[PDB]
Design a protein around this ligand. Sequence first.
Ligand SMILES: [Mg+2]
Ligand SMILES: [Mg+2]
Length: 337
Amino acid sequence: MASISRFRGCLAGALLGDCVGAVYEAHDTVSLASVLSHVESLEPETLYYTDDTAMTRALVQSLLAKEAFDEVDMAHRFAQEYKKDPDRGYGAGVITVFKKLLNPKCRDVYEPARAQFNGKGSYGNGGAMRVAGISLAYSSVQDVQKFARLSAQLTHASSLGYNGAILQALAVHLALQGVSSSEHFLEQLLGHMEELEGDAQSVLDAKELGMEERPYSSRLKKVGELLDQDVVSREEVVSELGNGIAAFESVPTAIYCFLRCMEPHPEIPSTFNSLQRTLIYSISLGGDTDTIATMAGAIAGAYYGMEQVPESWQQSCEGFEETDVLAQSLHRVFQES
Ligand SMILES: [Mg+2]
Ligand SMILES: [Mg+2]
């Protein structure tokens, strides 16, 4: 299929995951029944988007304005988007960065994020939730990793945070290539993370959080293991991979949802397509549902393209037309020969 369809499907998938997943954010238990009724309610209010989409748009705006990654422009756009519309459900950690970036004396736009958590940086998934645009703008894996890291570091300075951003960007990147045997898709991601998590900073950051290094790599191994199981309960998936705000407790989970939902689920009606199945499933894990779903939706939209974006769901989402234009513009500016 055509890259323009993947570009449009990628940002549509992200919007859908955020908008559809939002009502369940932070809920520790979400039944599949509940999520099915929620999505079936879109096939007779608008579903408003949250911080995930707001930041996705600001990231894309910066790339489009500059035709390149520009850290100063992007940092300022994040701050100004928050100032403009702060009630979108931003996390408590990131607001401190935005206030510091709005300081008229701020000259190093990475400094506020570095200062988070007593100089250790945040390890939340806010860098990852918005990173899809990077993978749409940059086609080399080298650039994807570099600008995924840099964009993430404007708010999430811990390697535990920015490495989750890189992982997500790489997942979206592989999906855009249409890569994909499931086995090879995982292998490649596992390979990149094994290398990135072997750097001194990665090891130091995990250690000083108490985790047994290579949190992404050990979880991507677990994803494979889970995928080799005939049946895994939702509770088992959450126990092994997580469903939280920590990037290591959401990005691998997003990836498992994507890979798992390439095949049917016995409790998800076959009337739903693969993109739909992925989002219902991911939301049914509970926890950080808007963000896990927005990330799974990004990867899935990139892989399945606009043909699996349901009209009834899409047209229920706030800003779906604006989202589509941003996707097309990224393709025009960065991907078109
Ligand atoms: Mg959100
Ligand atoms: Mg969230």
